[PDB]
Enzyme design. Structure first.
Site, PDB file in Angstrom:
ATOM      1  N   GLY A 169       0.792  -1.313  -0.051  1.00 13.73           N
ATOM      2  CA  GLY A 169      -0.075  -0.144   0.042  1.00 13.73           C
ATOM      3  C   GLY A 169       0.915   1.218   0.063  1.00 13.73           C
ATOM      4  O   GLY A 169       1.942   1.239   0.504  1.00 13.73           O
ATOM      5  N   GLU A 214      11.773  -6.414  25.957  1.00 17.43           N
ATOM      6  CA  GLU A 214      12.108  -7.836  25.974  1.00 17.43           C
ATOM      7  C   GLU A 214      11.977  -8.654  24.929  1.00 17.43           C
ATOM      8  O   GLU A 214      12.485  -9.587  24.405  1.00 17.43           O
ATOM      9  CB  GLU A 214      11.115  -8.590  27.158  1.00 17.43           C
ATOM     10  CG  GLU A 214      11.558  -8.168  28.490  1.00 17.43           C
ATOM     11  CD  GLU A 214      10.652  -8.521  29.782  1.00 17.43           C
ATOM     12  OE1 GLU A 214      10.082  -9.643  29.344  1.00 17.43           O
ATOM     13  OE2 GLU A 214      10.650  -8.103  30.779  1.00 17.43           O
TER      14      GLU A 214
HETATM   15  N1  LIG Z   1      -4.310  -9.399   5.205  1.00 20.49           N
HETATM   16  C1  LIG Z   1      -4.753  -8.340   4.687  1.00 20.49           C
HETATM   17  N2  LIG Z   1      -4.023  -7.615   3.730  1.00 20.49           N
HETATM   18  C2  LIG Z   1      -4.522  -6.434   3.449  1.00 20.49           C
HETATM   19  C3  LIG Z   1      -5.712  -5.936   3.710  1.00 20.49           C
HETATM   20  N3  LIG Z   1      -6.117  -4.843   3.166  1.00 20.49           N
HETATM   21  C4  LIG Z   1      -5.250  -4.713   2.293  1.00 20.49           C
HETATM   22  N4  LIG Z   1      -4.197  -5.657   2.254  1.00 20.49           N
HETATM   23  C5  LIG Z   1      -2.816  -5.604   1.660  1.00 20.49           C
HETATM   24  O1  LIG Z   1      -2.256  -4.606   1.468  1.00 20.49           O
HETATM   25  C6  LIG Z   1      -1.840  -4.410   0.114  1.00 20.49           C
HETATM   26  C7  LIG Z   1      -1.925  -2.786  -0.518  1.00 20.49           C
HETATM   27  O2  LIG Z   1      -1.953  -1.865   0.842  1.00 20.49           O
HETATM   28  P1  LIG Z   1      -3.291  -1.108   1.255  1.00 20.49           P
HETATM   29  O3  LIG Z   1      -3.337  -1.026   2.752  1.00 20.49           O
HETATM   30  O4  LIG Z   1      -4.548  -1.867   0.740  1.00 20.49           O
HETATM   31  O5  LIG Z   1      -3.098   0.304   0.858  1.00 20.49           O
HETATM   32  P2  LIG Z   1      -2.897   1.670   1.563  1.00 20.49           P
HETATM   33  O6  LIG Z   1      -2.136   1.471   2.826  1.00 20.49           O
HETATM   34  O7  LIG Z   1      -4.601   2.042   1.965  1.00 20.49           O
HETATM   35  O8  LIG Z   1      -2.301   2.665   0.997  1.00 20.49           O
HETATM   36  P3  LIG Z   1      -3.030   3.435  -0.314  1.00 20.49           P
HETATM   37  O9  LIG Z   1      -2.054   3.000  -1.939  1.00 20.49           O
HETATM   38  O10 LIG Z   1      -2.796   4.777  -0.409  1.00 20.49           O
HETATM   39  O11 LIG Z   1      -4.454   3.002  -0.741  1.00 20.49           O
HETATM   40  C8  LIG Z   1      -2.267  -5.344  -0.930  1.00 20.49           C
HETATM   41  O12 LIG Z   1      -1.423  -6.289  -1.301  1.00 20.49           O
HETATM   42  C9  LIG Z   1      -3.426  -5.946  -0.047  1.00 20.49           C
HETATM   43  O13 LIG Z   1      -3.041  -7.353   0.108  1.00 20.49           O
HETATM   44  C10 LIG Z   1      -6.270  -6.672   4.748  1.00 20.49           C
HETATM   45  O14 LIG Z   1      -7.447  -6.108   5.490  1.00 20.49           O
HETATM   46  N5  LIG Z   1      -5.894  -7.966   5.332  1.00 20.49           N
END
Ligand SMILES: Nc1nc2c(ncn2[C@@H]2O[C@H](COP(=O)(O)OP(=O)(O)OP(=O)(O)O)[C@@H](O)[C@H]2O)c(=O)[nH]1
Ligand SMILES: Nc1ncnc2c1ncn2[C@@H]1O[C@H](COP(=O)(O)OP(=O)(O)CP(=O)(O)O)[C@@H](O)[C@H]1O
Ligand SMILES: Nc1nc2c(ncn2[C@@H]2O[C@H](COP(=O)(O)OP(=O)(O)O)[C@@H](O)[C@H]2O)c(=O)[nH]1
Ligand SMILES: CNC(=O)c1ccc(S(N)(=O)=O)cc1
Ligand SMILES: [Ca+2]
Ligand SMILES: [Ca+2]
Ligand SMILES: [Ca+2]
Ligand SMILES: [Mg+2]
Ligand SMILES: [Mg+2]
Ligand SMILES: [Mg+2]
EC number: 3.6.5.-
Lengths: 53, 438, 350, 422
Positions: free
Chosen positions: B143, B254
């Site tokens: 992300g 720890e």
């Molecule tokens: N395990 C898990 N992975 C997640 C989840 N939501 C997003 N991801 C993973 O996060 C990755 C992308 O990051 P995001 O958190 O969706 O993006 P962001 O943090 O909102 O940042 P932006 O680009 O601005 O949208 C993807 O590869 C998803 O597989 C979740 O709820 N659970």
């Protein structure tokens, strides 16, 4: 096979088992940011100048 | 008693954070309205759960949490969700447009104009801490917010909180639940700027959680809810020592002393069991030797790798349920005689064991079935470097052609920061090999 | 339509499997860097196992067991045998050996001299041999001073073991030889032995009073065809096969190849692989492994078999490429990617 | 609330853009008067992306209709959903452009661009957060081509950090109004290469061959061709119109589809095109990738895929969707560049289009698109080598120098696509 550091309480217990013995300051961060901000402003300018031409 | 502040960044960090705190309340007997009948001290008290919860005069137990997303859609779910009453608006911060999966956009462009706000909201929680321990930072690698803004947030926390610890719960990029081609770029960019600022990082590969949901829970196509419900179970076991009476991992300091002799190698591998589908009418309850034995199968590692072809630098065993030390040792012995557990010559060959009697709580209606005993193993194996070699490899394939680089350069970042980050990973893989190979 | 990649251009064994794979019209070959593959014919040294088993919806298979180097490296095989209880330092089919690091770099120098001084005092045959993996560089000698002086002149790890002074000699000729057995291990860890072996024989009369001339002592296919003056005299290419060798054993010693030799070979292979099985097995792994091994055996005048070394990337005899390769595809490749026995199963406990 | 501003310019642009709003307005439960009569909450979840909410629960599209002659737009205002558009958003002249890029970009269009932008500013000033703009237009005409590009060049000046998305229609001698369409196209192409982020290439020749052969239609019409554009446009916007996590907005889409700034011309396609038969998920994919379901008139087997974005609509086994997509990649990986891992993403949408159990839409950033600019450049040079028909333009203030430049700006665009196919 030794058990050391045994601690016990109401909610559980823990121990250890041995088998065999053996940054950037707040100033530099602002400059890193203002430096990237300057590189966006400079590019946006070249774009506009290209459009003005 | 010492407090711990949890920070959730990006979509993944926020939803996962929503799943942990949901679990935390079911464990400590905290209702959605924040009331805890078992807590006899009204409005105060330095109990063990008070490390994650403050108390108001009205008796509400408030999580020491701070959610931060650059777009309101994901956090709005928490403001109107089931546990909306636990938090207050200050703890939830939302921008108006996200980072578009662009590290440069989350670190520089959008990050610069909201960092002083996040810090100010965090400073408010630290003031309520009589003796603040450190921070738990949840986020994702791929992300743009979970990667770009987090590395920046870490840089500042080390400035405003030099002596405090900072642990990570990172989500490794997995194409089976990812919608972003440049997630390798973000992962390698964020791990570079966050390395010197993180004291201990637990990497959870979605690919790993994905197959555990399809194999142990018979979910043909798992949803984020299915993945977060499980990741919280793991996170609950890793943080339980901070929230419950005990003597192993009682404070964040720890976690490094017990898991990170070498600083750069601060990525412990996790393993959890048993994971049993609740749909099964009934299952043969596993013993201690059977659950402990499972901790060395690749099938329940939060990252898929081969510890046999590596070396261990530390090892912890977190049991929860009907477990006594007698059965723990019995299992370990029979496991050494059958397994390949190679320790580095400069570290002892042992295991720190912790046992919490309360069995793992399951989310009513969730996918996991109630078990009588379970364990979560933390192992600092050089084998986890395989995950880096994969990621570093994809990074090489795309950057060799400069594909997608302009989106980052356009946000103000410098192209040299790519190679400067890559060269860092190359050194991280080298340190992993200097420790494990002969 | 299955797909596979190739990363070892020098691999002669799998150069035929790839040819056969394409002859079925159901296997597509990709570039050596396309990660979307079903089968990888990987490189010898530094094969990236960590990157295997992470393509969603693709079962991947590789032709090298990660960790097999523990068995195919000279110094590795020694430490593995002395340390592994399944083999013990008292193993009877592996010559007494020691690991010797050159003095410019654990090490077993003194423990080697103790057993050496004990032999020289007991009038027993005290002729040793030195060798290393970095060789095509071997020195045979009965003086411990010569052996130790030869290893120090190098810069890699070496090993000294007891030279079999009483090897089984074939007639006519009075010549030394060794036996090469090809053993294939599939994903289920079943151990198949190629019924067809080969005896790389020496075309020079064995001479125990002159270890300086190593033409009658070393039975490598490249040495006999280079420094031997009777190459190809008795048998073609200095390669006798389990049929001709089985007849000679009956005409001279009045026994069969199965009983005298083949039984021991089938036991050495069993005990070697079963030992490291817990360390290299790919039972619950994200990918699957299978490797072809080339075992080299020695037979003494008492018809006792000894283990020389194991080959993790061996080459096959000319006359056995077609039959064996097809067997690899039937039980090792097609057994995982079915299309639209010349082996001997060695049952064991997993 | 991320808003998108729609713009449609010229005869082809407005006819195409008109059917588009007719297609999606039905999928979102919006009647010709702007009222809602749907039955699912997903129709309104992301409704404000393309619709402004007025008084009385009315939904007014965020569209601006632009032309230099009233002929076409008058038909829109008298069309089925003509009464739904903002009466003020109709900006038109009377001179017309006469299929002349110069008139649309320098003379006639210049006299009306200040006024078109004033409405763009009005719509943007009401947007809580504006993602960007999407333009529909042709490139062989005069208004949509000459003036359309003139708008983008200026819109990017007032909104430099907003996504400029366009639906460009490429002219084909098999479906040509005039012989000068090669001139108009080459001129606009260089403008799209410069000031746009995402351009859905829609070759009329492909639309024609699809209507003639695959659809068995004897004599095709522009109306027939516009059902394909309507259907195509309906799908490519599904990521933005309904609840979803993949390619949810324009900038995220651009980031996952454009590895290089000047290579942002996509090859679209969908399926399906004996009609009452239930179509299996395998069939949707087998066709979706076949060149006969792509409106680019290019054989992808002559190039390579840089990225791909498949969207599936309708209640279906989302597990069976993954399996099938992973089958096309593993049986034709020789047509996907190996230096971009997982360059194929799959999104699911529960709301199907109209009256179809399930559908699939194809978005491809393929190097075979160079075959398209090859035809245009070939037809351009065929005339520019003799200066034929240049007087229609030189009389409008242009010089042969500006033509030679556009001709070379595109030949460079082809070489760029060619160095990555190897
Ligand atoms: N395990 C898990 N992975 C997640 C989840 N939501 C997003 N991801 C993973 O996060 C990755 C992308 O990051 P995001 O958190 O969706 O993006 P962001 O943090 O909102 O940042 P932006 O680009 O601005 O949208 C993807 O590869 C998803 O597989 C979740 O709820 N659970
Ligand atoms: N202890 C010993 N006693 C008798 N002969 C021995 C011996 N050790 C090695 N040899 C001889 O050396 C040869 C094996 O050499 P080694 O296997 O170490 O080199 P290498 O691995 O390059 C040949 P290969 O092709 O089998 O791998 C055999 O032919 C054998 O005759
Ligand atoms: N697919 C399609 N193409 C069209 C339509 N109308 C015009 N065109 C094409 O657009 C080109 C002419 O552009 P035109 O619409 O006259 O541009 P304008 O002057 O801005 O209106 C020709 O190549 C036509 O084939 C239409 O309704 N559908
Ligand atoms: C010459 N008489 C016209 O009315 C005329 C002819 C041609 C044009 S054009 N196609 O725009 O170059 C305009 C107008
Ligand atoms: Ca209390
Ligand atoms: Ca620090
Ligand atoms: Ca005029
Ligand atoms: Mg997000
Ligand atoms: Mg060898
Ligand atoms: Mg027209």
């Amino acid at each position: 096979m030794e058990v050391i550091e045994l601690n016990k309480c109401t909610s559980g217990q823990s121990f250890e088992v041995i088998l065999k013995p053996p940054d950037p300051s707040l100033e530099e961060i602002q400059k890193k940011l203002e430096a990237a901000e300057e590189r966006r402003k400079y590019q946006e300018a070249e774009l506009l100048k290209h459009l003005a031409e | 008693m010492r407090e711990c502040i949890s920070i959730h960044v990006g979509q993944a960090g926020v939803q996962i954070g929503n799943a942990c705190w949901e679990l935390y309340c079911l464990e400590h007997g905290i209702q959605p309205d924040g009331q805890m009948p078992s807590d006899k001290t009204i409005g105060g008290g330095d109990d063990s759960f008070n490390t994650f919860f403050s108390e108001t005069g009205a008796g509400k137990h408030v999580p020491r949490a701070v959610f931060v997303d650059l777009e309101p859609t994901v956090i709005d779910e928490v403001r109107t969700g089931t546990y909306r009453q636990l938090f207050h608006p200050e703890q939830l911060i939302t921008g108006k447009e996200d980072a578009a999966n662009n590290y440069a956009r989350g670190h520089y462009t959008i990050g610069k104009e909201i960092i002083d706000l996040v810090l100010d909201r965090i400073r408010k929680l630290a003031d309520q801490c009589t003796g603040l321990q450190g921070f738990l930072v949840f986020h994702s690698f791929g992300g743009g917010t979970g990667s770009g803004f987090t590395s920046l947030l870490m840089e500042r926390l080390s400035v405003d909180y030099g002596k405090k610890s900072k642990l990570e719960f990172s989500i490794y990029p997995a194409p089976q639940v990812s919608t972003a081609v440049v997630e390798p770029y973000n992962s390698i960019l964020t791990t570079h700027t966050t390395l010197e600022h993180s004291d201990c990082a637990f990497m959870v590969d979605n690919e790993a959680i994905y197959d555990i949901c399809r194999r142990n829970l018979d979910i043909e196509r798992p949803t984020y809810t299915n993945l977060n419900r499980l990741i919280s179970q793991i996170v609950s076991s890793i943080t339980a020592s901070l929230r419950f009476d005990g003597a192993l991992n009682v404070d964040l300091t720890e976690f490094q002393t017990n898991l990170v002799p070498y600083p750069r190698i601060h990525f412990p591998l996790a393993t959890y069991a048993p994971v049993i589908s609740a749909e099964k009418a009934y299952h043969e309850q596993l013993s201690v030797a059977e659950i402990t034995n499972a901790c060395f199968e690749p099938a329940n590692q939060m990252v898929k790798c081969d510890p046999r072809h590596g070396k261990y630098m530390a090892c912890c065993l977190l049991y929860r349920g009907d477990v006594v030390p007698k059965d723990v040792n019995a299992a370990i012995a029979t496991i050494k005689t059958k397994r390949s557990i190679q320790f580095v010559d400069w570290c002892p060959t042992g295991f720190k064991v912790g046992i919490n009697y309360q069995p793992p709580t399951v989310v009513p209606g969730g996918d996991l079935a109630k078990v009588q005993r379970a364990v979560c193993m933390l192992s600092n194996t050089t084998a986890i470097a395989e995950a880096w070699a994969r990621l570093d490899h994809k990074f090489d394939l795309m950057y060799a052609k400069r594909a997608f680089v302009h989106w980052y350069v356009g946000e103000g970042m410098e192209e040299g920061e790519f190679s400067e980050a890559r060269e860092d990973m190359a050194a991280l893989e080298k340190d992993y090999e200097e420790v494990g190979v002969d | 339509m299955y797909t596979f990649v190739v990363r070892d251009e020098n691999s002669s064994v799998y150069a035929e499997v790839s040819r056969l794979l394409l002859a079925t019209g159901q296997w597509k070959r990709l570039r050596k860097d396309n990660p979307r593959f079903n089968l990888m014919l990987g490189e010898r040294n530094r094969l990236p196992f960590g990157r295997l088993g992470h393509e969603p919806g693709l079962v991947q298979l590789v032709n090298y067991y990660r960790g097999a180097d523990k068995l195919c490296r000279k110094a590795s095989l020694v430490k593995l045998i002395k340390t592994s209880p399944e083999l013990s330092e008292s193993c009877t089919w592996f010559p007494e050996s020691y690991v010797i690091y050159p003095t410019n770099l654990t090490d077993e120098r003194e423990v080697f001299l103790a057993a050496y001084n004990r032999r020289r005092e007991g009038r027993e045959g005290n002729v040793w041999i030195a060798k290393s993996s970095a060789g095509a560089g071997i020195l045979i000698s009965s003086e411990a001073s010569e052996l130790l002086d030869f290893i120090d002149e190098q810069g890699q790890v070496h090993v000294i073991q007891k030279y079999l002074e009483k090897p089984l000699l074939l007639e006519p000729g009075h010549r030394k030889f060794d036996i090469r057995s090809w053993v294939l291990v599939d994903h289920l860890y079943n151990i198949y032995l190629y019924r067809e072996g080969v005896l790389r024989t020496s075309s020079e009369p064995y001479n125990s009073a002159n270890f300086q001339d190593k033409t009658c002592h070393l039975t490598n296919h490249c040495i006999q065809k280079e420094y031997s003056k009777n190459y190809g005299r008795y048998e073609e290419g200095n390669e006798m096969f389990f049929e001709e060798f089985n007849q000679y054993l009956m005409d001279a010693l009045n026994t069969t190849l199965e009983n005298s030799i083949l039984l021991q070979i089938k036991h050495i292979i069993r005990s070697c692989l079963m030992c490291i099985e817990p360390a290299i097995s790919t039972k619950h792994l994200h990918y699957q492994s299978f490797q072809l091994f080339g075992f080299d055996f020695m037979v003494d005048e008492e018809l006792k078999v000894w283990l020389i070394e194991v080959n993790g990337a061996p080459a096959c005899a000319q006359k056995l490429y077609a039959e064996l390769c097809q067997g690899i595809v039937d039980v090792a490749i097609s057994s995982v990617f079915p299309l639209a026995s010349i082996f001997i199963k060695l049952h064991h406990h997993h | 609330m991320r808003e998108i501003v729609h713009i449609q310019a010229g005869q082809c642009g407005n006819q195409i853009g008109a059917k588009f709003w007719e297609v999606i307005s039905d999928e979102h439960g919006i009647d010709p008067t702007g009222s809602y009569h749907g039955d699912s909450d997903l129709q309104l979840e992301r409704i404000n992306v393309y619709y402004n909410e007025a008084t009385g629960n009315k939904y007014v599209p965020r569209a601006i209709l632009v032309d230099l002659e009233p002929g076409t737009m008058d038909s829109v205002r008298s069309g089925p959903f003509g009464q739904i558009f903002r009466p003020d958003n109709f900006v038109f002249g009377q001179s017309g452009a006469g299929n002349n890029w110069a008139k649309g970009h320098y003379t006639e269009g210049a006299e009306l661009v200040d006024s078109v932008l004033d409405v763009v500013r009005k719509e943007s000033e009401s947007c809580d957060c504006l993602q960007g703009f999407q333009l529909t237009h042709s490139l062989g005409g005069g208004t949509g081509s000459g003036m359309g590009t003139l708008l983008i060049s200026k819109i990017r000046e007032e909104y430099p950090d907003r996504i400029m998305n366009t639906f460009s229609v490429m002219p084909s001698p098999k479906v040509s109004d005039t012989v000068v369409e090669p001139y108009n196209a080459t001129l606009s192409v260089h403008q799209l290469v410069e000031n746009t982020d995402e351009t859905y290439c829609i070759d009329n020749e492909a639309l024609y061959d699809i209507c003639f052969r695959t659809l068995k239609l004897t004599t095709p019409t522009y109306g027939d061709l516009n059902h394909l554009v309507s259907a195509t446009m309906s799908g490519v916007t599904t990521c933005l119109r309904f609840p979803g996590q993949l390619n949810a907005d324009l900038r995220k889409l651009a980031v996952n589809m454009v590895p290089f700034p000047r290579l942002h011309f996509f090859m679209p396609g969908f399926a399906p095109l004996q009609q009452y038969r239930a179509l299996t998920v395998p069939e949707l994919t087998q066709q979706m990738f076949d060149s006969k379901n792509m409106m680019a008139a290019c054989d992808p087997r002559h190039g390579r895929y840089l990225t791909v974005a498949a969207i599936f609509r309708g209640r279906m086994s989302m597990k069976e969707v993954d399996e099938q997509m992973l089958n096309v990649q593993n049986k034709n990986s020789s047509y996907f560049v190996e230096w971009i891992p997982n360059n194929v993403k799959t999104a699911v949408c529960d709301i199907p289009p109209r009256g179809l159990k399930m559908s699939a839409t194809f978005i491809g950033n393929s190097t075979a698109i160079q075959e398209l600019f090859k035809r245009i450049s070939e037809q351009f040079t065929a005339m520019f080598r003799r200066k034929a028909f240049l007087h229609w333009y030189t009389g409008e203030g242009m010089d042969e120098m500006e033509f030679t430049e556009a001709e070379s700006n595109m030949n460079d665009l082809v070489s760029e696509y060619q160095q990555y196919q190897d």
